[PDB]
């Protein structure tokens, strides 16, 4: 159910859906079309809706190797290692609960998911997501490992748990493809399947009705026959691509994994400065670091206050007014004072 | 060089230095005076001599 | 051992330490934590201090299949292929002698090393290191394959040698750990372990005692226990993170692999120029290449000297002085011109 | 022959190439010297010339498992799926017809092929040819999935075929081969090799002779014999490295597969704009998309026409004169304006 969350997956049997972005040239009912990308975090981790249940077993068990792939026979395997998220490169995977797959990646304009878990060789689709490097801090360096800083930043807290936002699961759909019908040599001899083979043919025996047996409506042609597939024990995610074959909207709720929370990030503070103060004005020599927005606000009354995202080893003429200035140069605190 | 009180538990001995002035003065070095020499003499330095000094 | 370098390799117990970058989010005990990427070379040979002893087997087997790695005990094994060094993509490894790994990678702001050879899924770090492709030459492209020019540039000496400049490996340190002890209802017990364990209890006779064997301290608690890291048969690499638990810095010096020498480089020449003659001035029609800093300077008195990184097809107004200026269209011949 | 095109490829059997691009530092006989990387198509499917057979069997059978490789004796095989094309990442291959390999790669400065069949870890060459993203349209983004556009772009139609323009497989390469002859102190023995080796000793009878088998040569010394191999079932690729060792080229054909066709690519259409009208002047508030060119032309007589590749959500004042301007803001239709 929730402790193994794959039972909350198993309430609505998930499957791949129609995305027109289907492998750099085509589209299809992809097994891993990106249902939606959700990344609201200063921690720099993307989260995506995946076509499979990454975490549900073939019987909907908590399976570390198992990402439940999709087929016509919907019970499809997927190896837990075969999932590759190439956004602008092979980004770092972070977690997968249900369709919620979250992880880090480099800068980029798009993201591609690749997996071949029932099929051979890595079915992969690529959508657009302008993954910027929007990090906070007076500097601009994307490397945690300095002994330099700690600041508040939001990030997707990766605890696997029940729910804060439950995506819907309803409407096992029909679609514009029901090819399980057959031509029995003068009739529409439709093969029986595991579900309601709705033999919606032009007339005869084929006009309506789920087929638990091979429904042979004699005196039918191929065009005289029309397929139908009605199933059960399922729930569609949103029908985003999703030809909405739900007769009535009503779903269950499956909690979105990795609830975001406030953590701390490590910002590297660069080499501070050289100060040479003269009559009424000073000079601040900054060697270059990872690019740092140095701010000089005139400490006093309503005064000139400028900034510069400095990226060289250059000397900013710190206007050192009689009231004084405020030197805020990067990750260091706002060290500003009066005439020296 | 300036050391700092590091992150406890681990041995992180943070020691903040200046930028590398040899590298910052080599890379980001100015216009090479061998070019732009007046009189048009090619300043070549096995020994630093301005051969072909016009 | 120097040619087969495994003797000087096996003098030092190769082992890893707590690196602050541990797989996008952690700072953990990196078995392959990068020491420092030192590369003085025009050939672009990044030379990192290897966290394991990549090359020396569990018995100091100088065999390419064995890369000496870290564990709780000193014996850690990795495959020679299991190393990955990605700057913005996995650059080809150039060589690996124990504590020194060296190779060329593409441009980037951070170098990431990872080894999964006994390690679960490429245990490694990603430290920020601005890999700049600032090669020499009038032009600015990175392709050897043109048959245009050669120039003298530095390169890490790709042969292995016994030593040219050794890093001193010495002082097998302590640890920060207590799991070697176990309190059984009064008895702090030390079994055979993979870390050296000075028994240092919170109160009792356990002030001394090596840790590779059993010792009991009855009537004590786990908080009343005390651990220490004893040592034998090794010397720590540099102690960059390295809790300096050696008494005095005195160990061997393993020769730094890849002693760089001045080599040549295939210098790419550009399509030269078009001299449109005139009256006291000429035009230089230039097509673009991989971009080239074209410089034309006056030849005579204190002269105009222009030099711009030409990066397109354009026309440069070379002033045609009476003596004539000296023009250079990037990495071509330096040929000046008189008034034609 | 042509349907199985590998028969026409096997008329002049696949070869190798001593390309100076040889694996990031070397220059030698690769099987994948990039002979010609030609892709003049708006769909971005670069066609590269590979010296082996892309899919031609060793028995000349169209078998996708085999990729034609080379040896000293010409019969070299490789895993036809194991080959890869890494431009700035692993550029997606589209197909292989003989000496042509066609694929779409990411934006980058050069492309490399890597194939290891007997080859030690994907023997690769890396040519530099800046595969830019020069696609047409109002916007500038590479994302098909939103239903936004359909503009005609040219691309290599990926059908196999017999020929549209055949590369001349001619000039069977008269090859040197002199390492296969060994002088035992009075007898230059040239054993069986990968072709009939004409061997010229400096004096005596060593001038010619079939050396696809053994032949002794009187007075065999190390300075005496020079070797060459002359065979058939071969026509030259281009003689790209290829010394013209045939007397004259006897140009058979190999139909260069993947012909070009003018197809229609789905372009992105951005959110259009807001229009604020003033006295003779209009302010188009453009929300930003992937960077899009808004063009406002004053419709009428000789009048100001401005076009700016706008790249941030701002407001451009297209002046709306008494004749009225025509303001096409991006890849939408040209919505003109009349004064009102």
SS3 C8: helix
This entry's atomic model was obtained through cryo-EM
> How far is Cα A196 from Cα A333, in angstroms, rounded to an integer?
69
Residues on chain B bordering chain A, Cβ-to-Cβ distance under 8 angstroms = 4, 6-7, 12, 14, 16-19, 24, 28
DSSP three-state, residue A265: strand
3-class DSSP state of C93: strand
D116/C contact by beta carbon, under 8 A: no
Whether C144 sits inside 8 A of D19 (CB atoms) is: no
The beta strand positions in D55-137, using DSSP E, are 66-69, 76-79, 84-86, 92-104, 111-115, 123-127
Which chains are within 8 Å of A by 3+ CB pairs?
A: B, C, D
Closest chain D CA to residue C93:
D24
Phi then psi for residue B22, to 5 deg, are -70, -45
Structural resolution in Å: 4.8
C89, C92, C141 member nearest D24 (Cβ): C92
Query: From A289, which residue of chain B is nearest by alpha-carbon distance?
Result: B19
What 8-state DSSP symbol labels residue D78?
E
Q: Where are the beta strands (DSSP E) in A1-92?
A: 17-19, 28-30, 46-56, 62-68, 84-86
Number of Cβ pairs closer than 8 Å across B and C?
37
Q: Are A76 and A31 in contact (CB under 8 A)?
A: yes
Collapsed DSSP state (helix, strand, coil) of residue D54: strand
When scoring C18, C25, C116 by the number of chain A Cβ atoms within 10 A, the one with the most, hence best to mutate, is: C25
Task: Tell me the C-alpha distance between C303 and C296, whole Å.
Answer: 10
Q: Sign of torsion, CA B3 B6 B11 B14? A: negative
Q: Please give the distance of CA A273 from its chain centroid, rounded to a whole number.
A: 41
Q: Which segments of A24-65 does DSSP mark as H helices, in order?
A: none
Q: Would the CB atoms of D92 and A24 count as touching at under 8 Å?
A: yes
Contact A142 C23 (CB under 8 A): no
Give the residue among D175, D178, D177 at the shortest CA–CA distance from D223. Answer: D178
Phi then psi for A49, rounded to 5 degrees?
Answer: -90, 120
Which H or E element spans position D19? strand D17-19
Nearest CB to A271 within list B6, B7, B16: B16
Calculate how close chain C gets to B13, using CA atoms only, in Å. Answer: 7
Q: Indicate left, alpha or beta for D31 from its phi (over 0: left) and psi (-120 to 50: alpha).
A: alpha
Cβ of C295 within 8 Å of Cβ of B35? The answer is yes
Q: How far is CA D228 from CA D16, D45, D63, D189, D197, in A?
A: 16, 39, 32, 14, 5
Contact A237, A17 (CB under 8 A): yes
For residue A12, give the nearest of A169, A165, A194 by alpha carbon.
A169
Residue D136 pairs with which residues in a beta bridge? none
CA C183/CA D48 separation, integer angstroms: 69
Contact C241 B38 (CB under 8 A): no
User: Are A316 and A308 spatial neighbours (Cβ–Cβ below 8 Å)?
Assistant: yes
For residue A221, how many other CB atoms are within 10 A of its CB? Answer: 12
List, as own/partner pairs, every contact residues C125-128 make where C-beta atoms lie below 8 angstroms and the sequence separation is at least 24, other chains included.
C125/A145, C125/C19, C125/C20, C125/C21, C125/C22, C125/C30, C125/C32, C125/C33, C125/C34, C125/C51, C126/A143, C126/C21, C126/C24, C127/A143, C127/A145, C127/C19, C127/C21, C127/C34, C127/C37, C128/A141, C128/A142, C128/A143, C128/A145, C128/A290
Chain D residues touching C150 at Cβ < 8 A: none
Distance from CA of C106 to the nearest CA of D (A): 10
d(CA D261, CA D270): 28
Nearest-by-Cβ selection for A20 from D104, D141, D145: D145
Q: Is A340 exposed, middle or buried (0-12, 13-18, 19+ CB in 10 A)?
A: exposed
Which residues of B make CB contacts under 8 Å with C?
9-12, 27, 31, 35-36, 38-40, 54
Rg of chain A on CA atoms, in Å:
29
Q: Can you tell me the distance from the alpha carbon of C158 to that of C119, in angstroms, rounded to the nearest whole number? A: 28
Nearest-by-Cβ selection for C305 from B27, B36, B39: B36
Angstrom CA distances, D144 to A37, D237, D266, stand at 16, 37, 6
C-alpha–C-alpha distance, residues D69 and D119, integer Å: 9
The answer to whether the beta carbons of residues A328 and A297 sit under 8 Å apart is yes
Secondary structure of chain B as H, E, C letters: CEECCCCCCCCCCCEECCCCHHHHHHCCCCCCCCCCCHHHCEEEECCEEEECCC
Q: Which chain D residues touch A109 with a CB distance below 8 Å? A: 141-143, 290
For chain B, the chains sharing at least 3 beta-carbon pairs closer than 8 angstroms are A, C
DSSP H helical segments within D84-169, as ranges? none
Top residue of C108, C144, C149, C265 to mutate, by most chain D CBs within 10 Å, is C144
Q: What is the DSSP letter of C7?
A: H
Q: Which of residues 208-267 of A touch D (CB under 8 A)?
A: none
Chain B residue closest in CA terms to C241: B11
Closest by CA position to A79, among listed A89, A93, A64? A64
In chain C, whose CA is at the least distance from the CA of D25?
C144
* SS3 state of residue A49: strand
Which of B9, B11, B40 lies at the smallest CB-CB distance from C326?
A: B40
In angstroms, the separation between the Cα of residue C287 and the nearest Cα of chain D is 16
Q: How far apart are CA C26 and CA C36, in angstroms?
A: 19
User: A109 in contact with D at a CB cutoff of 8 Å?
Assistant: yes
Q: Do D144 and A21 touch (CB under 8 A)?
A: yes
* Coil vs helix vs strand at C142: coil
If you ran DSSP here, which 8-state letter would residue C192 be given? S
CB contact under 8 A, A130 and D290: yes
Is the minimum CB–CB distance between A142 and chain C shorter than 8 Å? yes
């Amino acid at each position: 159910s929730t402790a193994n969350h794959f039972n909350a997956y198993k309430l609505t049997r998930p499957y791949v859906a129609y995305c027109a972005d289907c492998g750099m040239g085509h589209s299809c009912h992809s097994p891993a079309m990106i249902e939606n990308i959700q990344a609201d975090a200063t921690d720099g981790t993307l989260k995506i809706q995946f076509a499979s249940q990454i975490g549900l077993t073939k019987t909907d068990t908590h399976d570390h190797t198992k990402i439940r792939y999709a087929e016509g026979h919907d019970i499809a395997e997927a190896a837990r290692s075969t999932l590759k998220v190439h956004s602008s490169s092979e980004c770092t995977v972070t977690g997968t609960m249900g369709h919620f797959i979250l992880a880090k990646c480099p800068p980029g304009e798009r993201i591609s998911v690749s997996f071949v878990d029932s099929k051979n060789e890595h079915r992969t689709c690529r959508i657009a997501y302008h993954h910027e490097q929007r990090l906070i801090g007076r500097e601009r360096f994307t490397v945690r490992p300095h002994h330099g800083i700690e600041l508040p930043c939001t990030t997707y807290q990766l605890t696997t748990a029940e729910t804060s936002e439950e995506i819907d699961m309803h409407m096992p759909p029909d679609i514009p493809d029901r090819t399980i019908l057959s031509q029995q040599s003068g009739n529409v001899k439709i093969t029986v399947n595991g579900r309601t083979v709705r033999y919606s043919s032009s007339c005869g025996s084929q006009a309506v009705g789920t087929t638990t047996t091979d429904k042979t409506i004699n005196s039918c042609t191929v065009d005289k026959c029309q397929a139908y597939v009605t199933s059960h024990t399922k729930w569609q995610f949103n029908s985003p691509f999703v030809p909405r074959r739900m007769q009535a909207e009503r779903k269950g709720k499956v909690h979105i994994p990795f609830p975001l929370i406030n953590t701390t990030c490590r910002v590297p503070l660069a080499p501070e400065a050289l100060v040479r103060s003269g009559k009424r004005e000073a000079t601040l020599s900054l060697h270059p670091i990872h690019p740092t927005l140095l701010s000089y606000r005139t400490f006093g009354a309503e005064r000139v206050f400028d900034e510069q995202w400095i990226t060289a080893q250059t000397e900013v003429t710190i206007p050192v007014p009689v009231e004084g200035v405020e030197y805020q140069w990067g990750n260091h605190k706002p060290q500003r004072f009066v005439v020296a | 060089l300036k050391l700092a009180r590091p992150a406890a538990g681990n041995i992180h001995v943070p020691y903040t230095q200046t930028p590398s002035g040899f590298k910052t003065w080599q890379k980001d070095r100015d216009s090479p005076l061998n070019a732009k020499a007046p009189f048009g003499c090619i300043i070549q330095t096995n020994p630093v001599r301005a051969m072909n000094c016009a």
